[PDB]
Design a protein around this nucleic acid. Structure first.
Ligand SMILES: [Ca+2]
Ligand SMILES: [Ca+2]
Ligand SMILES: [Zn+2]
Length: 860
RNA sequence: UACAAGCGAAUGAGUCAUUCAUCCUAAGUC
RNA sequence: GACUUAGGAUGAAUGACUCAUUCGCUUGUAGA
């Protein structure tokens, strides 16, 4: 392996490098750059309070103007940035700003009472202890709230919120009838207030509904709340507490960035409340919208972080823009591979970029080597465009860091001031985040997680993902720049490109005057003036003439440039079709018999000079094989030397228009006028027969005999009741079987569809086990003996009792107890049904039913 | 959408194993 | 005409894993 799909290896991630490099705690006066965070909601819902995120570095003015949408539950919330100036923070204001982020991001995410009551009875506050280790100088933010009240502009930081948060922090550092901790409050209205508990952490959301209940009120193995806090914490309540608070508690982050299931069921549940006495509660004077808006931040900052790695790569290729200035949101989905769940995932750019690279390499090797023959050029073109050579060029330029295999679990998300309750420790060995390449880190082994991240940044890469990412970057620079834009990217990676000497070939051909008209009639049908008469004449001579000039080198250039034209034509018109259907639509146009069908339709084949009489009989056979229309389809496939003519035309006029490429598509558009469209697309018939028979569940066997010049083949299919046959003979025999397949398929369309023994004579092999065995043996047995597929029916069971006991090697507790009864339709007999009993898996229930029907099938 | 862990089902992707293909560019043997 | 290998762009059936979002149940939680 050298870049295939089985070799897997580590690669290190890359930090943002525009996020932070240092901090102003030495100079004791620090200046920041501000970036607004406003939220606009589609559903009316609730008005989200704004934020601002600070840095030391500024942004690249395309990241600083971004619009994104967030899919919360059913509502859709938009988000934007729109930067606002600068800001200068004094020392004590910088100390108040740190406790805010260390209090809220440790409130809903993690715990801020680090101390075990069970291990050793000592509890801390997490802010008394030695912090700044968590910051780990590589990530720096200081997100701050903003008062959204604006006359024209609101650059305020809402300092009452920061002072209240710092006041309750220093309070917990020290540690009619109404009573909180620290605040008496107002008995009148206490809705939408925000509290903290003192005996535990977990700052709470909206308190509401002061209910007619005491602290001595029935719990629902405890009688009242008072004995519960007397027992579980050893805390007596200072007041009898005729009021009592119920409140909504705080969940975690949910990856509210991609609509997984809203637009494709989520049966929502009522909200689980909690109760606490009010004298265990200390009051914060912060608003509630700033508490509802915390959940929106670890979804927006992963976009804003993934766009910084986009703009860092964009400024790393370029030394001189021609006019190409592409969006940073197109670098982002040119690198993210398909394992990351997102909208667009770089395969669609890759299908374009491979053909761009093939075209540039083919015309470059044509123009550099005028003396070298066709097969020797295709080997050097095989050396450059290969999928192992790009792996040598990609990881040498350190592009492997940005590859984003990813899953984006949002639960970890290492913040600046977060304690991060979910660590996965480094068992990888080395401590630097980037790995050097060595066969210790290469592997060919399953049962390992692809894309899962270590703390330092390591992850396994499929190594096809790093090899085709060089092709997608070429594609991205083509769709937003021009062809001259994607010449600089091939100049970056080290692929040699030399488009200057395109004069000398036509020069040495047009000084071939008198050594070594009928060419007039060819230019009527091409609809082109043609600057050089000799170049057009050169792309005609078969090889029968035995002249020094050849027409297969221009064919080598022409198939490449025509592949690139057809694959850039399909890329713009159909925006939604992936690479699996686009490859089929491209194979419909560059089919080699399709080009033979075009060269006869425009009556261009008669200009071909040839002396091989073996070929001449095939032309006479092929043109008489045409039928009347609708178009005239051929009876046989015919020659490949006739279809190479229209490919050789695409190379000659390319040189005569001097490497211009919009002119050649102006010529071949009227010649190719019935271009294919995905509804009218007709698969080659044997492939469609195979993909039809595998879909329904019917099996067929094939027979082939290349007896003489005439080759015939028969296909026998097995339906549920009747067998079907198809005959077919052709000289090649590769397609003759496809013609027999089409003869059977038009018939099959008329029925409106588009160790142990067997019963007596057939013989089952030795039985297999381990979760997939007998279904595999039964499937291979149904493939050999032409039977249809069995259909499995199950019966789902549920037990609320906390044991469903099924035997085996282990005890195997469960909750399922599945059992399944199947039917096996055997031709010209009756259907047979039987059931298994045990083993609470769907698949293992199917397996037990297979074993039971094979034991019943023996005694019959 | 209180949190963590385990068992089960549905949907969608990725890799692997076995056996059959479609399309183009080259090469060798009989 | 047969077969094999090298290079790039792909698809279908059956089976095992892994990840992603949601749902039912169970033990535990300085959760109530
Ligand atoms: Ca590829
Ligand atoms: Ca050809
Ligand atoms: Zn590691």
């Amino acid at each position: 392996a050298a870049g295939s799909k089985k070799r897997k290896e580590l690669h290190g991630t890359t930090c943002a490098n525009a996020l932070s490099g240092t901090w102003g705690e030495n100079i004791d006066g620090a200046t920041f750059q501000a970036y607004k965070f406003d939220f606009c909601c589609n559903i009316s819902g609730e008005v989200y309070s704004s934020f601002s995120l600070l840095l030391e570095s500024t942004l690249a003015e395309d990241v600083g103007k971004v619009e994104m949408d967030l899919y919360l539950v059913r509502k859709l919330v938009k988000a934007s940035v729109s930067p606002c100036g600068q800001i200068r923070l004094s020392q004590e204001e910088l100390v108040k700003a740190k406790y805010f982020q260390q209090f809220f991001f440790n409130g809903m995410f993690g715990k801020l009472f680090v101390g075990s009551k069970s291990q050793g009875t000592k509890r801390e506050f997490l802010l008394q202890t030695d912090t700044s280790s968590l910051w780990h100088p590589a990530f720096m933010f200081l997100l701050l709230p903003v008062e959204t009240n604006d006359l024209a502009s609101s650059a305020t930081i809402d300092w009452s919120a920061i002072n209240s948060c710092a006041s309750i922090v220093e309070f917990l550092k020290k540690n009619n009838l109404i009573h909180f901790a620290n605040a008496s409050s107002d008995k009148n209205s206490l809705e939408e207030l925000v509290v903290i508990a003192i005996h535990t952490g977990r700052i709470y959301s909206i308190v509401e509904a002061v209910s007619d209940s005491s602290a001595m009120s029935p719990f629902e193995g405890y009688a009242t709340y008072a004995e519960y806090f007397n027992k579980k914490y050893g805390i007596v309540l200072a007041h009898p507490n005729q009021p009592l608070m119920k409140l909504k508690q705080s969940h975690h982050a949910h990856n509210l960035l991609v609509d997984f299931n809203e637009e494709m069921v989520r049966k929502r549940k009522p909200n689980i409340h909690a109760h606490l006495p009010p004298e265990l509660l200390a009051r914060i004077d912060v608003p509630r919208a700033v508490l509802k808006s915390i959940y929106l931040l670890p979804s927006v900052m992963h976009r804003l972080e993934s766009l910084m790695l986009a703009s860092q790569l964009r400024e790393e290729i370029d030394c001189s823009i021609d006019n190409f200035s592409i969006s940073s949101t197109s670098i982002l989905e040119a690198v993210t591979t398909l394992t990351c769940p997102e909208s667009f995932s770089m395969e669609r750019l890759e299908l374009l970029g491979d053909s761009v690279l093939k075209y540039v390499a083919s015309c470059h090797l044509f123009l550099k080597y005028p003396d070298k023959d066709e097969g020797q050029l295709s080997r050097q073109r095989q050396s450059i465009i290969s999928n192992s050579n790009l792996h040598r060029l990609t990881t040498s330029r350190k592009l492997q860091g940005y590859i984003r295999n990813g899953a984006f679990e949002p639960r970890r998300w290492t913040a600046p001031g977060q304690f991060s309750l979910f660590p996965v420790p480094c068992k990888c060995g080395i401590d630097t985040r980037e790995v050097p390449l060595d066969p210790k880190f290469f592997t060919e082994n399953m049962t390992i997680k692809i894309g899962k991240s270590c703390d330092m940044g390591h992850r396994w890469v499929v190594s096809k993902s790093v090899s085709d990412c060089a092709e997608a970057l070429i594609g991205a620079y083509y769709v937003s720049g021009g062809l001259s834009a994607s010449l600089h990217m091939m100049k970056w990676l080290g692929i040699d490109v030399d488009f200057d000497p395109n004069l000398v070939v036509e020069a040495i051909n047009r000084v071939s005057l008198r050594c070594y008209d009928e060419l007039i009639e060819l230019e009527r049908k091409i609809q082109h003036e043609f600057s050089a008469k000799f170049l057009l004449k050169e792309a005609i001579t078969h090889s029968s003439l035995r002249e020094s000039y050849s027409y297969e080198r221009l064919e080598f250039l022409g198939d490449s440039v025509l592949d690139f034209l057809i694959t850039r034509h399909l890329f713009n018109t159909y925006e939604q079709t992936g690479p699996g259907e686009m490859t089929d639509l491209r194979s419909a146009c560059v089919n080699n018999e399709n080009f033979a069908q075009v060269a006869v339709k425009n009556n261009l084949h008669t200009h071909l000079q040839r002396c091989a009489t073996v070929l001449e009989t095939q032309i006479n056979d092929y043109l008489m094989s045409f039928q009347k229309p609708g178009r005239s389809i051929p009876s046989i496939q015919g020659p490949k030397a006739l279809g190479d003519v229209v490919e050789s035309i695409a190379g000659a006029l390319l040189i005569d228009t001097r490497l211009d490429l919009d002119q050649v598509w102006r010529v071949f558009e009227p010649l190719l006028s019935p271009l294919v469209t995905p509804d009218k697309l007709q698969l080659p018939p044997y492939r469609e027969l195979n993909e039809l028979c595998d879909s329904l569940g019917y099996f067929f066997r094939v027979k082939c005999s290349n007896d003489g010049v005439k080759a015939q083949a028969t296909i026998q299919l097995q339906l549920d009741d009747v067998l079907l046959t198809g005959d077919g003979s052709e000289q090649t025999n590769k397609l003759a079987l496809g013609k027999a397949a089409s003869h059977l398929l038009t018939q099959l369309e008329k029925r409106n569809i588009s160790e142990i023994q067997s019963i007596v004579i057939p013989f089952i092999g030795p039985i297999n086990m381990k979760k997939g065995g007998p279904r595999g043996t039964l499937h291979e047995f149904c493939k050999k003996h032409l039977w249809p597929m069995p259909t499995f029916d199950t019966s789902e069971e549920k037990s609320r009792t906390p044991f469903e006991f099924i035997d085996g090697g282990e005890k195997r507790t469960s909750f399922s107890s599945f059992t399944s009864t199947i039917t096996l339709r055997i031709p010209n007999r009756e259907a047979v049904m039987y059931a298994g009993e045990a083993r609470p898996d769907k698949k293992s229930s199917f397996d037990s039913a297979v074993v039971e029907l094979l034991y019943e099938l023996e005694r019959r």
